[PDB]
Amino acid sequence: FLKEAARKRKFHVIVAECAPFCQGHEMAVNLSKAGIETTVMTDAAIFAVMSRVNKVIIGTKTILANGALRAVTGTHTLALAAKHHSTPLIVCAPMFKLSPQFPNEEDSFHKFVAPEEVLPFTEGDILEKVSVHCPVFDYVPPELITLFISNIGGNAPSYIYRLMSELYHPDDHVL
């Protein structure tokens, strides 16, 4: 999306990096390999920089039957920020990232990965009483997004629960 919509213009791309294990960093290298003015930052100061940002393009993992997608971690706090500064949330998800379940259907809706990436084993004794959570998928609510860039065009969080019936069936929710 960006490195095609930025071979005409040149502008500000503030790539946060996923703190559990840096994910946006190869993103930044790949973007900069065309010179797009990419600024990498640690995901803990978004509410600092959010007020000098215009369009919030977030890449998501999958969507739901509310529009309330769940994406790479730290996107829910980015959504709370980018609504506290009322910027748009220009999601970019093709069709096949859309599953007709509902938000509170999965016990541990997230996907906890090995806490070894949050407090590596080489730490020591303090690893005896530390519940080192690591939920690498966070759950955006419905009302924080505004504009799905699906590969049919733009859409809104209330032209999704019909993309179900246009793509799936009612009784394939449980599969």
């Binding site: 369009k55 748009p88 220009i90 504009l147 733009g154």
Partner: peptide
Amino acid sequence: KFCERVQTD
């Protein structure tokens, strides 16, 4: 007047 395009700003 429903043009088939979208605009957020």
